[PDB]
Structures are given as C-alpha cells and as structure tokens.
Design a protein around this ligand. Sequence first.
Ligand SMILES: *[C@@H]1O[C@H](CO)[C@@H](O[C@@H]2O[C@H](CO)[C@@H](O)[C@H](O)[C@H]2NC(C)=O)[C@H](O)[C@H]1NC(C)=O
Ligand SMILES: *[C@@H]1O[C@H](CO)[C@@H](O[C@@H]2O[C@H](CO)[C@@H](O)[C@H](O)[C@H]2NC(C)=O)[C@H](O)[C@H]1NC(C)=O
Ligand SMILES: [Mg+2]
Lengths: 507, 512
Amino acid sequence: TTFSLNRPSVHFTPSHGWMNDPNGLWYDAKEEDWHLYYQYNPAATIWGTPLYWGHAVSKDLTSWTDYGASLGPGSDDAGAFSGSMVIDYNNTSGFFNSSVDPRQRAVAVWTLSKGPSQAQHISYSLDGGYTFQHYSDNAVLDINSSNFRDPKVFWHEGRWIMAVAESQVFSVLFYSSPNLKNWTLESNFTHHGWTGTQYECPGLVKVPYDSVPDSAWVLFVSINPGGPLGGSVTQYFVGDFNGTHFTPIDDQTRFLDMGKDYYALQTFFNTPNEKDVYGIAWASNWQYAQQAPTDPWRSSMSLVRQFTLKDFSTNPNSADVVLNSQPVLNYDALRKNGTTYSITNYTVTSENGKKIKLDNPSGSLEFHLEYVFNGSPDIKSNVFADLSLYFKGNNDDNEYLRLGYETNGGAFFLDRGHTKIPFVKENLFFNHQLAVTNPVSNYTTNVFDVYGVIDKNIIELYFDNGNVVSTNTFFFSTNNVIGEIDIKSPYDKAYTINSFNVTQFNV
Amino acid sequence: TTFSLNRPSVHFTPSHGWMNDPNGLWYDAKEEDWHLYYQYNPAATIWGTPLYWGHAVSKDLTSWTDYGASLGPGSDDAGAFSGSMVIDYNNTSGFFNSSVDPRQRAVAVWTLSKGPSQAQHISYSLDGGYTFQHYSDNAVLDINSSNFRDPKVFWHEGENGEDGRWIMAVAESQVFSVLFYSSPNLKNWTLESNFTHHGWTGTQYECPGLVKVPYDSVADPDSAWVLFVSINPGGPLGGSVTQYFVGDFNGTHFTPIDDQTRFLDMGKDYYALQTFFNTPNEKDVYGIAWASNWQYAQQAPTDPWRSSMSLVRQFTLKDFSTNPNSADVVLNSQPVLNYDALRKNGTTYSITNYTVTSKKIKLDNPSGSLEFHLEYVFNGSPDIKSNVFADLSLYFKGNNDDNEYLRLGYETNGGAFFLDRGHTKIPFVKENLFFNHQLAVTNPVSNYTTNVFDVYGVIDKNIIELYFDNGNVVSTNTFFFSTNNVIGEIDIKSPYDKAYTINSFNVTQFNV
Ligand SMILES: *[C@@H]1O[C@H](CO)[C@@H](O[C@@H]2O[C@H](CO)[C@@H](O)[C@H](O)[C@H]2NC(C)=O)[C@H](O)[C@H]1NC(C)=O
Ligand SMILES: *[C@@H]1O[C@H](CO)[C@@H](O[C@@H]2O[C@H](CO)[C@@H](O)[C@H](O)[C@H]2NC(C)=O)[C@H](O)[C@H]1NC(C)=O
Ligand SMILES: [Mg+2]
C-alpha cells in the first residue's frame, strides 16, 4: 500500500535494476531463440552510468530468461546507449571465420555516450549474442556531436543502411556502408511530423500492405520530451525509400500508440518467416518512469506487435492508410492453461445486473468486447451516458480500472486513478483520465470491437482489430489483483453487449 | 453544490442558451466596434435546431453587449452553421448603394445545414451588422455534400495588373480537405485548390482559415502565410483541437514550408479559432476561439448559458525552437485585453528574489478575475534525484471553500508545467471522465544560459489561460468551482527547500 509490488507475467521486466529501451532485437533461427536487449542500469532502479545492454531470450515472446548485463561502455563514465543488431550472413565485416554459423553472425551497432561525445561503435558476438567484442580501438562514426544516437541498421539490396538520430536538430541521418566500418552520409531527413524536443530512436522498415501495391516503407521516430500528452511518444511516417532518401507519401502525423506509456519502439532485425514485421516498445513515459512505484525493477516492456499497413480511415466517407498492430503472444498455451468466462446478447440494464467473478484471480487477463449503442429517449447531450466495465480487484475492490465508452464524447475512456498507491496521486503527469477515439468496425451495424490485455500494472487496448492502440500502466496495491469485472450503465437498455469473453491467464 | 454559477467577466458568454464557435468576426472602423458572432441556441443550454448566429459588440474586446439572435436559417429543422464576414469595400457584391459606408459593407458567408444538405449561403447587412438579409433564396456554393462547411473568406490583392479576388477556405470535412475557391463577386465561386490530408487529420477537418501574418525574423521575410485547421473529433487529448501550418499562398495554392504539425493551443478547451476579417492597423492578425471541448461542452455545469469564448490573441510568427541547438518557426500568441483599464481599476501584488522554503497571498475583495506573471528558476539540491516529485506548485485556493483549488506549477523530473483542475466539489468534474484533471505543457526557458522560465496566466472565473516564453506556447482550460467561490488565496509550495527560486510574481486582480 505504498509500492505496487505486482510484477507483470507476460510483459518482460528486468529481474532487478532500471530498464529503459529495447535494443539489439534479433532472431536466432538455428536455436529458434528471440533476443531482446535493453538499456539497463543494474546498480539501481533509476537511470545511471555505467549503462549496459541487458539481455534476455525467449522461445515464444511470452516467457523471458533475463541474463542481465552483456554489452558495456568500457568505463564508469560512459553509456552503451541505444542501438541495434544485424546478421552479417555474407561476413561483410569480416569478423567471422567459417566456424560461426551464418545465422548467428550477430553484429551490434550502438551509441557510446561519454562526456560530451555520442558516437557509433560496432561490436560482434562470436557466441550467438551472449558476449561481445569491440571492433577496433575507436568508433566507426563520430561527427563531434553531443546528440548523435540510436543507430538502426538494415541490409538494403547491396549495402548496409543506418538510420541515426541527430536528435537536437530533429534529423534522422541515413548512412551507407559496405562493411559496417566505413560509413558515408547519404541523406538528412529533418523537421517532419510531431517534432517535440528531440528525435530519438529512428528505425526504417519495409512493411506488408493489405490493400482493398504489396509493401510500403515506414520510418519510426520516437519523441522525448515534448509529446502531446507530455513526455515521450512514438510517431511514424508512411512512404518510400529510394536507396538514399526517405520520401513520405503525405504530410500527416501518425502516432503508433494513443496511450501515455509507449516509447522507443524497435523492430526485430529478422523474424522466422522473413516477411512479418515485429517490434516491441518500452512501456513507460520519461516524465514519471523513474518514480514508478515498483521494486526491485522499474521499467516494463510492451507486448511484441505485428505491424501491417492497412487501408483505413477514421470515418466512412474517406480513404487513408494506417499501421495496424496485432499482438504477438503464445495464445495456444496461454488459453489452454487458462479459464474463460463469457456473455452474449446482453442488453445492459440496472434490473438485469451482470458481472464476472474470476476464479483464483491471477492479475493477467485478456478480453474481447463487442458492443453497440442502441440509444434511449432519455439520453441527450447534457448527461454522461456511459457503458462502463469496472475491473475491480480481489483484496480491495476500491482499486479498479474503469474502462468503457460514452456517446456524448463519442469515445472510449480509461480511468486509472482509483488506487491507494500514493504515486498515482502525487505525480501530476500520471494522468488519471485517458481517451481514445475508437472507430466502429462496420458502419451499417455500428459495432465496436475492443480487445484488451491486463498484466498486473499494464493494460493495452486494441480497437478495431488493431487500427487504434492505447497502452498505459496502472498500479494496484501489492497483491491486489483484478478478480471481478462489473458491467454498468445509468441508462437501461441504452447499450447492448453482443459478446464479452474474458480469459484469465494462469501464470 | 451541483452547478457552478460563476460567469466569466473578461471572456464573452451569452446571456442564456448554448454558444458554440466564433463567427463573422469583423471590425467596424467607422464606429470602432468589434463584431463577434456565435453559433447559438437560445431555446436551451444544449446544441439544437434551429441554430442561429448570436451577435455581440465590443469597444475594447473586453466588455461585450449581447444582442441575441441575428442571422437565422429561416426554418425550424434547419441550422445556420459557421461562417465568416467580409467588408465589401468596393461593392463587388452589387448589394450596397452609396448611402452604405464602404467600411460597413458587411457580407456574411455561412453554411446552411438543413436535412442532409450543407451548402454555403451569403447574407448581407445594411445597418452595420445587426440585421441581415439572405441573398437569392438559393446557395452560392453547393456540391451535394453532407459535410461541406465553415467558409472563411479574405481578399487577395492581385499583383501586376490582375484584378484581385475573394478567397474562400472551406472544409470538406470527412475527407480532411480545406478547399480554396475564388470569386470576383462573392456569388460565382470556382475551385482553385484542394489542401488535403495534412497534419493531424483526426476525424474531420473543421473551421479553416487562411491568413497572412507578420514575421519577426532573427535567424541565420517580412511575412508568411498561416493556415488554421480545427479537428474534431480526434484530438490527441480527445475531442477538439486547433492546428496550424506555416507556408505561402501563391494565389491558388497553400504550400507549407515543412510537414510539421503545430498545435495553436496545448490545452483542452481551445477550438474553432476564427481570425477577424480586418484589424485597425490593417496588418495585425487577431483571433478568437471557443473555450471548451466538444466531448463535454454541452454538459458543463453553468446556467443559463453554456459556452464561453477565449481572449482574442495577436498572432505573429517568430523564430523559435524547443532546444537551444536548432532552428524552427512558431506562431507566437499575445493576449489582447484592455490592460490599461483593467489594471488601473484593479489591485496589484508582487514578490521578488524569493527562494522557496517551508509564503502565501490573500486577495483583497476577491473578484475571481486576475492576471499573474511568473519568472522562476531551478537551483538543484542534494536531495533531488530521478525518483521523486520535486515540484514548484502554486495553489490558487477559493475564498468560501478552499478545498477547491487550482494547482499549477513546474516539475524538474518531468521537465514540464502542470495544471490540476480536479480539486472541486462540482460533481460534473468527477462524473465526466473526458474532463481531464491533469494537463501538461513542455514549456521552454526564455534564455538558455540563465534557465529562467516565464509564465503569464489569466484566470477569469471558470477559465484559465497560460502563455509560456512570451507566448510561444499557450494552454487554455476550463475549471469549475462551486457557486460563489472565486479564487481567494495563492500559496507557493515545494517539498525541497531552496530547490526553486521565484524571481518575480506580479498578481493583479481585476475589479470589474
Ligand atoms: C478533395 O480531395 C479529397 C481527397 O483526395 C477528395 O476526397 C474523396 O471523396 C470521395 C467522395 O466523393 C471519397 O469516396 C474518397 O475516398 C475521397 N478521397 C480521399 C483520399 O479521402 C475530394 O473529393 C476532393 N474534393 C474536390 C472538390 O475536389
Ligand atoms: C541535417 O539537417 C539539419 C537541419 O538543417 C542540420 O541542422 C543544423 O545544425 C547546426 C549545427 O550542426 C545548427 O546550428 C542548425 O540550427 C541546424 N539547423 C536546423 C534547421 O535546426 C544538421 O546540421 C544536418 N546534419 C548533417 C550531418 O547534414
Ligand atoms: Mg457547428
């Protein structure tokens, strides 16, 4: 009842220490292992030097083995700031004698921050990405810059292309290299979208496109500080990449996530089928991430997501384009081992009150919800006319997430202030109220689809099969856990729930 | 305890009924009268039809006389939606005999919304903007659309010997389009360009307006063009929002200088900004906005009026960037009030060289309307690290009940300014979950070697505006105290002593 010592079970967290950004994401196809590195301060639960890349491995992006610090700066003064991994199949670096399986030639491209210089180094691994050896005595790219970070490198066919943030000038620099050693400047993408205070963590990616062409390039650009809710946010651009220059199709601003706690998204260098685009993000915000009431670890990661470009618009009378997000979890094992509750053709009304009590609550559930607004004569514009689901919890049912929809605001809401944890009341950037403008799925029926995941301190809401997504953290009291889901509305028969599956995860 | 009956004193509110976006703003240079029109329902405090244009007049953009319903749709079901006003000096409309002063030849260009149709009509006034007459018993720009609204018109002086034209900016809303039509005579219109899918599209483009704005260049021209586009639904905070683009107008096309997204106001309750057709200086650009959010506006706890307007602001383009290592360009906003009259009819307070340690201000004969200025700086402290809330807060408490208060300040770990507007007894503020309690803005320093933050606030009963870095950043929000409970005391607090230093703090209550 001062800290919130409930730890996620399907979002990766460090065993201990401060975790702050996904790094070196790659997939080892011989061992069938997913590798997730992260910025890590092992000494404490706030950002500090020396900063390493923590390292964790998963068979299924659901269960993580955290091996702790792996890649390091080389002195207490410095940081192994963010960066990426690549698989040098053809041995362009020349680091790899025949004895290293081509599928495991992991080379890491990363920012050294020391004093006033941020410059990019490379370090190859000769043990499948568990330890690393620094290439030479020096960096491979130094521009006498203090803000020069977050290299994300891919193979373009062919050369290596690097995207780096010259953060303070709002620039993604693009650099090419034959061998990962000699880098030459190629184009300077600058002053696009929502600029905030800095550009951080760029990553350029080719993404499938389910039309109604085959693919499209996408540039991710993270922003901190200066995001529209406060602090950090992640935006993206849709366009094409000519080998040197990135050209956005349009002049639109697009956020990946409409919640306050989603930042520093990075994509896996590779996936098993070599087409799908997966990526993960740090699940917090820089305004309050180091004061989060968790111990002995601090930051959490989001779920992995699959990104595909879809034709979509926010109303039925126009045409636009949007990055759909589908969640990647091991749902076979999670749903087999877990207990499901459900509702159908339920017209919400005070007389027929309905609720779901969860047997042996675990704090980790998913749900699909399908609802419609029937309207009522008694609803008009000067009343709050909401369909609320209170996710109440087992030991203190005064701590709850309140989530739902209201006509007169035409939107979905998340209330995350109802908790005894002091932090949520004391830190004034942890907003109680969050909103998302969720489209219907079918404009002749006006059916709303929400799919959500709850894991102890974090909730992710995917609207309209993943066209809109909102990720936020909550903090219940310790060992308080969601055990009752309660359905309410002050207007009888005003709403109707077609479908409402819950599935508690037993973990 | 349920309804917050405190009416704003320097912001415009109708006598009674529901008020919505600003419309037909112009300046009468003959009588020196500012004319404001508003989306209006007099029959209730919620939107409904028939919607009229309410009319207000003011000498100083500070005190307004409300004249009620002036422009109407002519039918019960229908609605007289947003539009703008032009002064047809050289009588290009063919409506004005010479007994009508040129400075007074007022033509309203507005949207008629009736059943499934939304089309642009024009009406005109022969008594300087109080009564109006519809022209032709038909629209002047129809495109059988259901989402075709909010025409904002200005005059484009032709160069070389080309005559010059009226330019209309309209919203083809659902397709995120500002269409630019020209006309010689405000009657026959022709499509010139289709500005589409820019910035923050949200759900709909609404209330567009093209303007040319002075430019204070201190970089490495004289003017630049600005395009205002309002978005609702789909603002990032939820509901409504106003963005702007910076660029050039070549006579048919607006062309932005980048693909940046710039919000005019970072608060939750600043929407549908319209600029005045004309100003006294013929070069300054003034704008007014509707001070609420569509998500909760028709639920606000006020009677017998529902919406308020913001202060008029003076918009000027300056060189600005959010860090000291880059260049960019920003729309600076500068409040426009009758400060001479207000401050001299009113009571001042000061505080200097103050370093915060475990001071309060009692306002004498509280009026509830006040301005304040604040310069502060952060000093550091052994006891402040990344895992604490090290805030400098200012609690504007209430006289009758002081458990209702605004809490605004800065915090170092979040590097940003906050406003907490939840602390009140008014049920609406707890019941409506779209009425955010906590608002934030990433306010810059005003000098990067002194690290001094500058903040100018205006707090009229139930509405607060904040300007940062001399108006490079603005955040506007409504708040609701109990009936007859205006701001009485401001207490300055910080949990870390000597961490912050308030160099200046000039409060000035308005006795209006
Ligand atoms: C202005 O441009 C927009 C966007 O290109 C046009 O919008 C299209 O309108 C039709 C209906 O007539 C829709 O079915 C399309 O989906 C819209 N396109 C897009 C991209 O959203 C609009 O018609 C244009 N208006 C004029 C007057 O030219
Ligand atoms: C990439 O483009 C940006 C944008 O023009 C360049 O930014 C300038 O950098 C200097 C110092 O390096 C600053 O004083 C200027 O203010 C920056 N300009 C702007 C508009 O912010 C940047 O230098 C370019 N970098 C490379 C490597 O080409
Ligand atoms: Mg309207």
